[PDB]
Every structure is written in structure tokens, then in C-alpha cells.
Design a protein around this ligand. Structure first.
Ligand SMILES: CCCCCCCC/C=C\CCCCCCCC(=O)O[C@H](COC(=O)CCCCCCCCCCCCCCC)COP(=O)(O)OCCN
Length: 160
């Protein structure tokens, strides 16, 4: 079949894995978080690109795409412009995405997918994780720079 996640996305996902592993010091858990994120992105993409959503689900998915776009733009801007980062804004955007994803797949998928969604967002939407990622530490700042470079390319190309 075709490759469903491109190289730029894979680099972003790897950097998200690296900050998650730095934050938790649990390589297995960090791998599980990132694999669950990938699995849900792939499932959502298969249903979306092959026209499997009904009208209500499609409204939810388009809302999800708009929220993700806002999240991506905000994440990049909070990295670029000093003294603008707000962990509550990021956490709230992420939890909006979580809820819309739960709703979009509620008819197609089961509790296992809801658990994958919650496992991912419980980590990434955590306010202390976000404040550490955007904080003064050199390791986090270097990874965040790579994340934002990749996200900016995805935004520019139209994939976020
Ligand atoms: C602060 C750290 C938090 C980040 C981690 C949690 C955030 C996860 C939330 C959202 C990320 C998932 C977004 C995928 C949305 C998929 C919906 C749908 O399948 O989109 C379709 C597929 O399009 C895509 O490009 C897929 C989207 C990218 C997939 C790979 C993304 C990996 C995750 C990157 C990081 C997420 C953003 C981070 C923002 C801080 C639309 O297709 P099209 O534009 O019509 O044409 C074909 C595209 N070449």
C-alpha cells in the first residue's frame, strides 16, 4: 500500500517521542504514547480520505481539522515570540481536539480507540508537560525547535 505518514510528519513524531521520553524517563510508555497517536491518526485518515464519515461526523472532523490548524499555528507562534506561551491556551486547544476526535470515531470505533485517544491527550495536554516543553531547559528547547520547524512546513504545505 501507500505510505500514510510522510517524512516531515515522522520527524515531528520522533521529536514528540523524544520530549515525552525526556519528561517521563519511561521509554516504553513514551513509545506507547507515540504509537497510539500514530494509530489514531492513521485510522482517522483512512476513514476521512475514503469518505466513510456521515454528515454529522464530517462536521466534527472538519471542526477537528480547524482546531488542529489553530493548535499548530499557536504552538509555532508561542515558540517564536517570547512571553506569549500560555499553557492553558495550549491545553484547552488539545482537549478540544481530544473531544472532537472521540465524537468523530464514536460510531465507527470502540472503547479501545477512546482509550488510545485519552492516553495520548492525557500526556500532551498536561499543563506541566507543556510548561516544561516551552520552558528554559536547553534539551526541551532544542527538541521544540525541531518540532516547530516540522509543524511550520506541514502548515505551509497545507497538511495541518
Ligand atoms: C504539544 C504536542 C501535542 C501534539 C500531539 C497531540 C496532537 C494530536 C492532534 C492532532 C494531530 C492529528 C492531525 C491529523 C488529522 C487527520 C485528519 C484527516 O485525515 O486529514 C487528511 C489527511 O491529511 C494529512 O496531511 C494528515 C495530517 C498529518 C498526519 C501526521 C501528523 C502527525 C502529528 C504531527 C503533530 C500534530 C500537530 C502538533 C501541533 C503542536 C486531510 O487530507 P487532505 O489535506 O485533504 O489531502 C491529503 C493530505 N496529503
Amino acid at each position: 500500500g501507500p505510505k500514510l505518514i510522510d517524512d516531515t510528519s515522522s520527524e515531528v513524531l520522533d521529536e514528540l517521542y523524544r520530549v515525552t521520553k525526556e519528561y517521563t524517563r519511561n521509554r516504553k510508555e513514551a513509545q506507547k504514547i507515540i504509537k497510539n497517536l500514530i494509530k489514531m491518526v492513521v485510522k482517522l485518515g483512512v476513514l476521512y480520505r475514503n469518505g466513510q464519515f456521515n454528515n454529522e461526523e464530517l462536521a466534527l472532523v472538519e471542526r477537528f481539522r480547524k482546531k488542529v490548524h489553530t493548535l499548530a499555528m499557536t504552538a509555532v507562534s508561542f515558540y517564536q515570540i517570547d512571553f506569549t506561551f500560555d499553557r492553558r491556551v495550549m491545553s484547552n486547544l488539545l482537549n478540544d481536539c481530544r473531544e472532537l476526535l472521540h465524537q468523530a470515531i464514536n460510531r465507527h470505533l470502540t472503547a479501545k480507540s477512546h482509550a488510545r485517544i485519552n492516553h495520548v491527550f492525557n500526556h500532551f495536554a498536561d499543563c506541566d508537560f507543556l510548561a516544561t516543553l516551552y520552558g528554559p531547559s536547553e534539551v526541551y528547547r532544542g527538541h521544540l525547535q525541531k518540532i516547530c520547524e516540522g509543524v511550520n512546513k506541514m502548515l505551509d504545505e497545507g497538511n495541518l
